[PDB]
């Protein structure tokens, strides 16, 4: 259970857009990671996310595994829209 996106954030995914993302992932029991340029990090945490340096025009992949697999993913997708990070 995963979903790919293309960051459109004119300023990539820094502190603000990072916290929101991990805060959304942290509402689910499922395990959710974020893949960028090969490296994969735990989405519930965060120095992890920011460390990726996800910039505009980046293609990232969010994935989850657990009871709420699809849930976590559906909320992360909505978060990518609310904060206009990409799709």
């Amino acid at each position: 259970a995963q979903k790919t996106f293309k960051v459109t954030a004119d300023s990539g995914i820094h502190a603000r857009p990072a916290t929101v993302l991990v805060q959304t992932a942290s509402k689910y029991d499922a395990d959710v990671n974020l893949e960028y340029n090969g490296k994969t990090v735990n989405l519930k945490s965060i120095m992890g996310v920011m460390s990726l340096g996800i910039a505009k025009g980046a293609e990232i992949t969010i994935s989850a595994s657990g009871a709420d697999e699809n849930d976590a993913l559906n909320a992360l997708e909505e978060t990518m829209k609310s904060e206009r990070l990409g799709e």
């Binding site: 300023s11 820094h14 502190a15 916290t19 805060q23 920011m50 340096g53 996800i54 910039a55 025009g57």
Partner: protein, 176 residues
């Protein structure tokens, strides 16, 4: 004027830190550990504060509670008597507030030193920090490093600001 606030005023690394939180959270016990680590106790439970000026607030303990700590289980202990003059201080200006909030799967806490929440005490905005009380958390160490980091930022070393600056460069570079 002089108001009585609820918490523990400890002198950490020269800074006045007012530890606040619901009774039961462990304020005294944490403070007790802090004096053993070399910090100074000003007031326990009841902290009498007054405004010294437009930017300064001073806290001190009512004579009756001087040098005292009440620890659930042990009762009343005198830190001056158990640790010497190095454990106590008559008073101090309050520079930071570290609030111990009981951690719940909802409550939020800034995972960045960016959070600049503040708290008013007699028209004086005192910087405030909120740390979660959760198992496996040594509260003393955290409150202590909060003072340390606070002092470091004022000396011109803001890890948060530096990181965000570098994070940005990384992102620019990443735009291959």
């Amino acid at each position: 004027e002089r108001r009585s606030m609820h918490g523990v005023l400890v002198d950490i690394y020269g800074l006045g830190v007012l530890i606040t939180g619901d009774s039961g959270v462990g304020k005294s016990e944490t403070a007790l550990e802090l004096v053993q680590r070399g910090h100074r106790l000003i007031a326990d439970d009841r902290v009498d504060v007054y405004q010294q000026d437009e930017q300064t607030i001073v806290g001190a303990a009512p004579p009756i509670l001087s040098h005292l700590l009440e620890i659930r289980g042990l009762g009343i202990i005198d830190v001056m008597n158990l640790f010497g003059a190095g454990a106590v201080r008559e008073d101090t200006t309050i520079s930071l507030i570290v609030h111990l909030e009981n951690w719940t799967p909802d409550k939020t806490f800034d995972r960045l030193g960016s959070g600049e929440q503040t708290q008013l005490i007699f028209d004086v905005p005192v910087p405030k920090i909120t740390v979660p009380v959760k198992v496996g958390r040594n509260l003393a160490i955290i409150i202590e490093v909060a003072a340390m980091n606070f002092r470091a930022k004022s000396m011109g070393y803001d890890a948060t600001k530096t990181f965000e600056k570098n994070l940005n460069h990384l992102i620019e570079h990443n735009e291959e």
